[PDB]
Amino acid sequence: LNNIILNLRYKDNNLIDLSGYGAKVEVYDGVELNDKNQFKLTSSANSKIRVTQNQNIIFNSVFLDFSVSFWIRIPKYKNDGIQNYIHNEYTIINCMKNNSGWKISIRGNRIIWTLIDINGKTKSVFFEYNIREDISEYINRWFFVTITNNLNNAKIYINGKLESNTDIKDIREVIANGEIIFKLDGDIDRTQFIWMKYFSIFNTELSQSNIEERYKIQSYSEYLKDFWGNPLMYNKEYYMFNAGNKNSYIKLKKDSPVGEILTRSKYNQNSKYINYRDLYIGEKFIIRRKSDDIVRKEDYIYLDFFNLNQEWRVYTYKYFKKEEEKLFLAPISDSDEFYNTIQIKEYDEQPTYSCQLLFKKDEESTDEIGLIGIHRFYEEYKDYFCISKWYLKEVKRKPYNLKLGCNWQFIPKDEGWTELQ
């Protein structure tokens, strides 16, 4: 909102400063830029942005009082290049003049903020996310960063919450109105890249409150999101993730038109530096419109999947007495003994990449059959892709329960997540 001295935003096929201070912004040819305000820095020498701050109005203060915010998406390590990922630090944003200033740096799974004052004194603060989680909230997924500086503290906030704090009471004058160079710099593979959006600078130390608000505003969209935080799309192959059953995936049971639930395979080598669960497993689903290709809250869809090259569909049986029942997975058909219409929902009021899938009788029927989920059926105990009436009450309970088994995320293949072995 207020105190914004740089505000890099997409406009008319270009990246511009909308702060009102009219910084000069030069995007070189190697930066990929789109109207979702996303830009990509690659390993190419022409993949850079030069921002020249207006030297007159912006001023270096005696003591630090300034903040930087942006969204970032950092690809997964390569399994065959773990050590290079762990060890090789590369600058992504550099803002120096007369050997003083600031930079943003990455070393594998660590993001690093660094200050150098006019006397050559340096201080750093970093945020590092775990690379041994079954399912990471951070790896190759859009998240929100804010760094704040005053005379006492450099802090990093992730997704609105304080993560790191360095004492910088020994830091004196920092020259912070130098050229800002957005460019990958250091010992990086040909393949390395970074995505960023909504890069902004403030001439104050932002409050936690101010940052949390910014997180929510910038999180907002009418459209739903995929697992990576990109817009959810019609007519796109997606694997399915369950936020309440993180390690579970859907597979058509052999010679039976139901979806059994199996346990995700993991990274199969012994390498004690990393661990992850495979994401590109289970049926390949695809969302179709019932009636752009962006999925919005309240849209009516078919949830389909590929059985070899045939396109099958997810149904609920019209007659079900129990609280929970298995879904029917079968060819596209008009049969009036099964509901085929789903309304995609977003019941969470906080930022999320999860959505819910609500079965209805038709597009105008006010009645609600239930939400798609996972349930343990006693036959042997065994988990199945299901519909459940039970979620209908749960989804109204505030605050919204993040870990309900009715919470789904859609995972497309992405160049920033490889898991071949």
Binding site: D255, S256, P257, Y317, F320, K326, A330, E337
Partner: peptide, 16 residues
């Protein structure tokens, strides 16, 4: 057709 034959399997799954 495939659909009605699968429906029969599904009825076993329902425990009907």
């Amino acid at each position: 057709d495939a659909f009605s034959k699968l429906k029969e399997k599904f009825m076993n799954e329902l425990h009907k």
